[PDB]
Design a protein around this ligand. Structure first.
Ligand SMILES: *[C@@H]1O[C@H](CO)[C@@H](O[C@@H]2O[C@H](CO)[C@@H](O)[C@H](O)[C@H]2NC(C)=O)[C@H](O)[C@H]1NC(C)=O
Ligand SMILES: *[C@@H]1O[C@H](CO)[C@@H](O[C@@H]2O[C@H](CO)[C@@H](O)[C@H](O)[C@H]2NC(C)=O)[C@H](O)[C@H]1NC(C)=O
Ligand SMILES: *[C@@H]1O[C@H](CO)[C@@H](O[C@@H]2O[C@H](CO)[C@@H](O)[C@H](O)[C@H]2NC(C)=O)[C@H](O)[C@H]1NC(C)=O
Ligand SMILES: *[C@@H]1O[C@H](CO)[C@@H](O)[C@H](O)[C@H]1NC(C)=O
Ligand SMILES: *[C@@H]1O[C@H](CO)[C@@H](O)[C@H](O)[C@H]1NC(C)=O
Ligand SMILES: *[C@@H]1O[C@H](CO)[C@@H](O)[C@H](O)[C@H]1NC(C)=O
Lengths: 49, 209, 50, 300, 188, 44, 98
């Protein structure tokens, strides 16, 4: 019901540190963002197409 | 997650009255009265009425033994029957609105129950109450707006450590795994799983534990 | 390697017997071979111990 | 009419759905081997004291013997002894042998009341399954005026169970004529709401609703002991070549327990309060015996 | 607290600790993979042997019983009565009748493979139609239950646990107390 | 004469169904309170 | 053994004194008293304790402080059967037939 306006915040925890171990392990960097809507995602007909 | 004792109280007052009457009928007043006050609980008391006293003292000890018996039956036979005991609960096999339970809206458990047509009915019980996020279900079940939730065991036991008002059941099913979501054929496909295997072989997974 | 029967079925199919009136167990293989009546007794398996 | 009219007049070949098997149905058409045991049912809603008395006399006699060795507790040792059995603070022994013997007797009384608590805990173990009516041979099943409440029974309308009643007891059919009903779940409600006292039906749906009843407040009689003891099957037309194959398929479905697996899939194996009124009735009977003994002593 | 511990461990010693004197059915894992301690079998060359030869998942029980399956049923009943065996697989009402005979014979809880007994017959033969119809005719009336009254339906605390040794010890203490009476005579 | 301030002695000496002589009480309120505490000791 | 050599080298050298031959050999060594503990895979010992004569030998917990791995099907690098076997195992998980 409100506009989105995704803001940067602090995020941490388990898989965060796992990905940090990955980026420290293999030669790459990363960029943390999150999903716009907190759903896993099920396959379903949208109203068009 | 008493009344029969009052009937015994009326009976022991009848016993005290007939003790006084038969002690008068035994060829003293406050002696027999306070004696009747002191018999019924085996209280400290420092011959035809003595026959009623001895037989009624046998009655009083079998009464308190029966009180020990039904308190033991009250606390041993009343094991907590609030346990759902997993998916095989017959109150959930044919569910009602008495047990409000659902799952996350647009979750993998929805498709997992949609394939299992033999669990359609619970599915049809859970399709009408699906929640957007899991914390909605957490706040609802903490304030008793739900009755059950289907989730992984480690996260639920973690939150039960976080919130001691939560109960996990005995059964366990759908022994699956969480890994890392991946794209198609990518040069960052093999080495990620290799690094996860490197974490499993050493104590880095133990460090995460 | 020729399979045959014995016992009550053996005396039945030899012509020595004509009808088994007995607590005779109803199974699939004998119904492939002989005919049955409609059952009079209904009972299941159980374990005798001491 | 019905499925029989469809099968006999051959607009339907067979009927896979569940149906009772009886005489004239087997006369008009054919049946397969049975697959489920479905009869009928009716849904409804000292010496230790003697030997311790002997040993109590032994202890009292040896207490009298110690008194004869060496000031009014001669025969009064029985009252104080049996009071220290129950630990009542009875309104003091002096002889050493008497103190040791009465102590061993009191320890024996303590461990005997501890064994009585063990008896009470074994009584706590015992869960009962009470049965008011134990078969079709009940004398309730002759006349509801023979007992003080005139009850109500009944079956499903136009059923084969009614035909079994009419071939067993047409007088029972006349009592059921005043006690008819219409709906199976309506009969369930009439049992729950007191409009009906008992119901007569095959064990299949009754055991099925026993596995889904809210509270299990309605239990049938037994498990098919003294009952009709028949089975369900598949009706086929006379001369069907499918019959032998269906029979062998049913026997193979039995022989692996897959029939039992489908039974387990389509059934459900389901089914504080202090109670002492039997022992309380014994308490009232023994206090009546005590006042009877007082009436005996009232001759003086 | 001593006598409370006494009450607690007597309730632990003779009340709740009911041993598994029976097996409680075929789903016993000690009988799924048995040993020499659990010698269970059935009648050799019987229908139970055929029904377990069909079972491709319980061939362990088939290999275990085939060393000990016996010829006749009653001799196996007498052998397990002498405890040469440990359990016996049989149909229901026969063992119920034998338990109604003598009260040393115990059934189990699991009731499975509800099979049926009928009349053994030939192939196509005119002694089958009216005979089976007569069987069904005898089912509807109580002649089945009349035959049950002939054979099937017709069947045929105390505290001696630990207080018997206490009874004997107090009976010996009576003699010891008489000896102490002789000691008191020796005191004078 | 001796259980004046020694109510703790007769009290805790009769919690446990002891059959040990202490004193014969004359106070009726004391006897009722002893009966209440002894009933609670039985259920305890 | 190789995982212990990666993890506990000195304790691998202590276990070098403690080697043995067979699964039933270590079973009898734990039944008699010539052995105090044993390290193996999880569900194998879970099944062998579930069929234990009297439930004598007991595991530690229910697999919590352990290597957290599984069993799989090995294929060569380049076999086209890999995706089919993976989808079939996922189907055998998805129906509860596993
Ligand atoms: C989301 O961030 C914005 C600030 O950037 C705040 O919420 C705004 O509030 C108005 C009120 O009507 C709405 O337009 C939207 O809810 C938001 N609009 C914008 C500009 O994003 C607020 O700080 C944050 N909201 C929450 C719930 O934390
Ligand atoms: C995956 O990881 C390896 C880490 O070794 C990356 O580097 C290759 O490593 C091997 C030896 O393990 C060398 O022989 C190769 O020469 C390395 N590659 C290059 C480009 O030099 C490797 O690049 C990573 N990528 C994948 C998916 O193979
Ligand atoms: C039981 O048998 C009677 C036979 O009389 C049938 O009664 C029919 O019931 C319906 C109910 O609407 C009526 O419309 C028909 O006119 C009745 N037919 C006859 C011939 O009476 C019916 O088969 C059964 N009764 C019920 C109500 O189930
Ligand atoms: C990553 O790769 C580059 C070459 O592409 C190399 O120069 C650099 O040293 C590497 N960094 C790490 C973290 O090894
Ligand atoms: C969009 O799809 C859903 C699901 O099929 C349907 O219920 C809904 O009516 C559709 N929207 C419109 C505008 O019809
Ligand atoms: C079977 O019963 C019918 C009844 O009419 C009879 O006519 C027929 O002869 C009988 N067949 C026999 C004797 O098996």
């Amino acid at each position: 019901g409100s506009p989105r306006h995704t803001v940067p915040q602090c995020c941490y925890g388990f898989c965060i540190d796992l990905l940090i171990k990955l980026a420290r392990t293999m030669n790459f960097t990363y960029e943390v963002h999150l999903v716009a809507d907190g759903k896993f995602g099920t396959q379903e007909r949208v109203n068009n197409s | 997650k008493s009344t029969l004792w009052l009937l015994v109280g009326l009976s022991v007052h009848v016993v005290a009255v007939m003790l006084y009457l038969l002690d008068r009928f035994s060829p003293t007043l406050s002696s027999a009265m306070w004696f009747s006050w002191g018999v019924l609980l085996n209280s400290g008391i420092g011959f035809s009425a003595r026959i009623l006293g001895m037989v009624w003292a046998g009655f009083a000890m079998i009464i308190v033994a029966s009180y020990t018996a039904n308190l033991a039956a009250f606390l041993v036979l009343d094991r907590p029957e609030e346990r759902i005991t997993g998916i095989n609960d017959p109150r959930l096999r044919n569910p009602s609105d008495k047990f409000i339970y659902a799952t996350v809206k647009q979750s993998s458990v929805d498709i997992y129950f949609r394939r299992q047509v033999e669990l359609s009915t619970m599915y049809r019980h859970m399709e009408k109450h699906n929640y957007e996020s899991a914390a909605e279900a957490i706040q609802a079940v903490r304030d008793n707006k739900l009755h059950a939730f289907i989730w992984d065991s480690a996260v639920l036991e973690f939150e039960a450590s976080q919130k001691c008002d939560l109960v996990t059941t005995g059964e366990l099913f759908f022994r699956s795994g969480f890994g890392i979501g991946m794209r198609k054929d990518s040069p960052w496909k093999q080495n990620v799983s290799l690094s996860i295997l490197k974490s499993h072989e050493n104590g880095f997974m133990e460090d995460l534990d | 390697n020729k399979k045959e029967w014995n016992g009550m079925m053996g005396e039945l199919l030899s012509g020595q017997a004509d009808m088994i009136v007995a607590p005779l167990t109803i199974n699939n293989e004998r119904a492939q071979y002989i005919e049955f009546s409609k059952p009079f007794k209904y009972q299941g398996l159980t374990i005798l111990v001491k | 009419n019905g499925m029989i009219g469809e099968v006999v007049y051959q607009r339907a070949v067979m009927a896979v759905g569940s149906l009772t098997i009886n005489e004239e149905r087997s006369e008009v058409v054919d049946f397969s081997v049975p697959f489920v045991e479905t009869g009928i049912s009716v849904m409804v809603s000292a010496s230790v004291w003697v030997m311790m008395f002997v040993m109590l006399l032994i202890v009292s006699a040896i207490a009298v013997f110690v008194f004869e060795y060496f000031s009014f507790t001669i025969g009064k040792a029985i009252w104080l002894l049996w009071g220290l059995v129950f630990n009542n603070s009875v309104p003091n022994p002096k002889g050493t042998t008497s103190k040791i013997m009465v102590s061993v007797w009191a320890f024996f009384a303590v461990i005997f009341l501890a064994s009585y608590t063990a008896n009470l805990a074994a009584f706590m173990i015992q869960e009962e399954f009470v049965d008011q009516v134990t078969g079709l041979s009940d004398k309730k099943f002759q006349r509801p005026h023979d007992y003080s409440p005139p009850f109500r029974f009944g079956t499903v309308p136009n059923g084969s169970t009614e035909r079994n009643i009419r071939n067993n007891y047409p007088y029972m059919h006349q009592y059921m004529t005043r006690f008819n009903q219409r709906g199976v779940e309506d009969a369930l409600v009439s049992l729950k709401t007191g409009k009906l006292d008992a119901f007569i039906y095959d064990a299949a749906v009754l055991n099925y609703k026993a596995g889904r009843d809210e509270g299990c407040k309605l239990v049938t009689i037994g498990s098919g002991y003294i009952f009709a003891t028949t089975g369900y099957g598949i009706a086929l037309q006379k001369g069907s070549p499918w019959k032998r194959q269906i029979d062998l398929a049913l026997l193979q479905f039995v022989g692996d327990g897959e029939m039992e697996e489908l039974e387990t899939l389509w059934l459900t194996g389901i089914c504080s309060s202090q109670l002492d009124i039997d022992n309380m009735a014994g308490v009232f009977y023994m206090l009546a015996a005590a006042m009877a003994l007082s009436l005996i002593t009232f001759i003086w | 607290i001593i006598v409370a511990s006494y009450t607690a461990n007597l309730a632990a010693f003779l009340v709740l600790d009911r041993p598994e004197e029976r097996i409680t059915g075929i789903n016993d894992p000690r009988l799924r993979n048995p040993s020499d301690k659990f010698i269970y079998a059935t009648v050799k060359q019987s229908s139970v042997d055929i029904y377990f030869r069909r079972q491709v998942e319980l061939s362990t029980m088939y290999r275990h019983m085939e060393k000990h399956n016996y010829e006749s049923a009653a001799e196996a009943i007498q052998a397990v009565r002498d405890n040469k065996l440990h359990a016996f697989i049989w149909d229901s009402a026969v063992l119920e009748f034998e338990a109604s005979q003598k009260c040393d014979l115990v059934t189990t809880g699991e009731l499975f493979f509800r099979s049926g007994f009928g009349i053994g017959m030939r192939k196509d033969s005119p002694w089958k139609q009216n005979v089976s119809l007569s069987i069904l005719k005898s089912h509807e009336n109580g002649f089945m239950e009349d035959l049950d009254k002939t054979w099937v339906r017709y069947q045929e605390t105390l505290t001696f646990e630990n207080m018997a040794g206490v009874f004997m010890l107090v009976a010996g203490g009576i003699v010891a107390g008489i000896f102490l009476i002789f000691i008191e005579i020796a005191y004078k | 004469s001796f259980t004046i301030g020694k109510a703790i002695w007769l009290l805790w000496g009769l919690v446990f169904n002891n059959s040990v002589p202490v004193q014969n009480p004359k106070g009726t309120t004391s006897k009722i309170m002893v009966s209440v505490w002894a009933f609670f000791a039985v259920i305890f």
